[PDB]
A = this chain, B = another copy of it.
Amino acid sequence: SMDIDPYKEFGATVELLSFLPSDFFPSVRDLLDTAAALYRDALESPEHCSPHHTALRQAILCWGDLMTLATWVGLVVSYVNTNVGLKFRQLLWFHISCLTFGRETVLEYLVSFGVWIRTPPAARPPNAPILS
């Protein structure tokens, strides 16, 4: 079979996004609403716009199919939100953040927050790293 990495063409890796803890990412619901709020006209556009746009379109739609399936099945519903949910919380956040703040900024922040959150509370700085 093949082994394809969705973040590879965007300069990152699966393991790199797994560096960030599970509770770091917003809910799938909050992510879909943000994609729409900031890029509704662009995501529905006839233009490619950018590779980030192309991937995000598939991501939103793919999660749609996944929800349509689990809704039809009705732990099973909980399965999508627990295991599959985490995967899209990463993917959706990655592209939205890259479109909003820029690829390079997102990547630096990723390693910066991973090191920061892993530092015990007593020693780590009060202000977490930010995008800009």
Residues of A within 8 A of B (CB): 1-6, 8-9, 11, 32, 35-36, 40, 43-49, 51, 53-55, 57-62, 65-66, 68-69, 72-73, 76, 79-80, 84, 87
Q: Which residues of B contact A87 (CB under 8 A)?
A: 65
CA distance A44 to B57 in the complex (A): 20
Of all chain B residues, the one with the shortest Cβ separation from A72 is B79
CA distance A35 to B6 in the complex (A): 16
CA distance A54 to B76 in the complex (A): 30
Q: Which residues of B contact A60 (CB under 8 A)?
A: 2, 4
CA distance A57 to B91 in the complex (A): 13
CA distance A58 to B51 in the complex (A): 12
Q: Which residues of B contact A35 (CB under 8 A)?
A: 2
Q: Which residues of B contact A84 (CB under 8 A)?
A: 65, 68-69
Pick 5 A–B contacts, CB within 8 A, sort by A.
A2-B32, A51-B51, A65-B66, A68-B84, A73-B73
CA distance A6 to B5 in the complex (A): 20
A48 touching B6, Cβ below 8 Å: no
Q: Which residues of B contact A9 (CB under 8 A)?
A: 45-49, 53-54, 57
